[PDB]
Amino acid sequence: ARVAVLISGTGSNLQALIDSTREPNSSAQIDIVISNKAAVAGLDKAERAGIPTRVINHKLYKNRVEFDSAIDLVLEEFSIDIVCLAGFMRILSGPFVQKWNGKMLNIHPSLLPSFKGSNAHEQALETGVTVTGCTVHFVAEAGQIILQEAVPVKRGDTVATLSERVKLAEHKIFPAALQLVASGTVQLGENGKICWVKEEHH
């Protein structure tokens, strides 16, 4: 499967994703990294790895739909099968999300549905949970969960220490989820729920 990664900044998890696709039995290849912001660290990561990049500036389009259509055109030109969001900070339009239904992944630094939105680590700490984690899910208008990994909150943790621990888990589950979807092992059913598929090819 041909994969695109959309970013807005540092491209958190991008290197983890790249590394996984270099592995022997990978079902995925990262073929393009697209940013809505020029000269961000994630682009440099991609470029240093020899992966094509594109910058699509939202300020050059009339509205959200026009902007997302420009992204989609690039995805079409590169024959992309699957999209991963790595710190993408714009809201994708309904039409874009619908087209990419069951083919676009995102990650969140909590065990959804807990701690939705920004600052999930601070939320976990303020709430006083002893268990948090990360969730990779398909993107919807939210979206069906593919994988989750629980991560302990330790006594004395700061936002930084908890964030680093959750990031190590993300480095593991984002590529694992990508491989599941790229291989066809995990697919979105016609009923809108996750389907674990037994593949014909052995």
Please report the DSSP string for 28-56 in residue order.
Answer: -EEEEEEESSTT-HHHHHHHHTT--EEE-
User: What residues have CB less than 8 Å from 92, skipping those under 6 apart?
Assistant: 68, 139
Of the candidates 58, 108, 121, 171, the residue annotated as catalytic is 108
Q: How many Cβ atoms sit within 10 Å of the Cβ of residue 98? A: 11
DSSP-based three-state secondary structure for 190 = coil
How many whole angstroms separate alpha carbon 173 and alpha carbon 171?
Answer: 6
Resolution of this model in Å is 1.7
User: What residues have CB less than 8 Å from 8, skipping those under 6 apart?
Assistant: 35, 36, 37, 40, 42, 87, 88, 89, 90
Q: How was this structure determined?
A: X-ray
Which residues fall in the annotated binding site for (6R)-10-formyltetrahydrofolate?
A: 64, 89-92, 106, 140-141
Nearest to 88 by CA among 107, 111, 109, 113: 107
In order of 91, 93, 98, 135, the CA distances from 64 in angstroms are 8, 6, 14, 27
CB 154 within 8 A of CB 121: no
How many whole angstroms separate alpha carbon 83 and alpha carbon 131?
Answer: 29
Which residues fall in the annotated binding site?
A: 11-13, 64, 89-92, 106, 140-141, 167-170
> Is 1-202 assigned to CATH 3.40.50.170?
yes
Angle 144-146-151 (CA atoms, 0-180°, nearest 5)?
Answer: 115
- Does residue 108 have an active-site annotation? yes
Strand order in the sheet with 82-86: 53-55, 29-35, 2-7, 82-86, 104-108, 131-138, 145-152
Domain edges within the chain:
1-202
How many whole angstroms separate alpha carbon 48 and alpha carbon 174?
Answer: 21
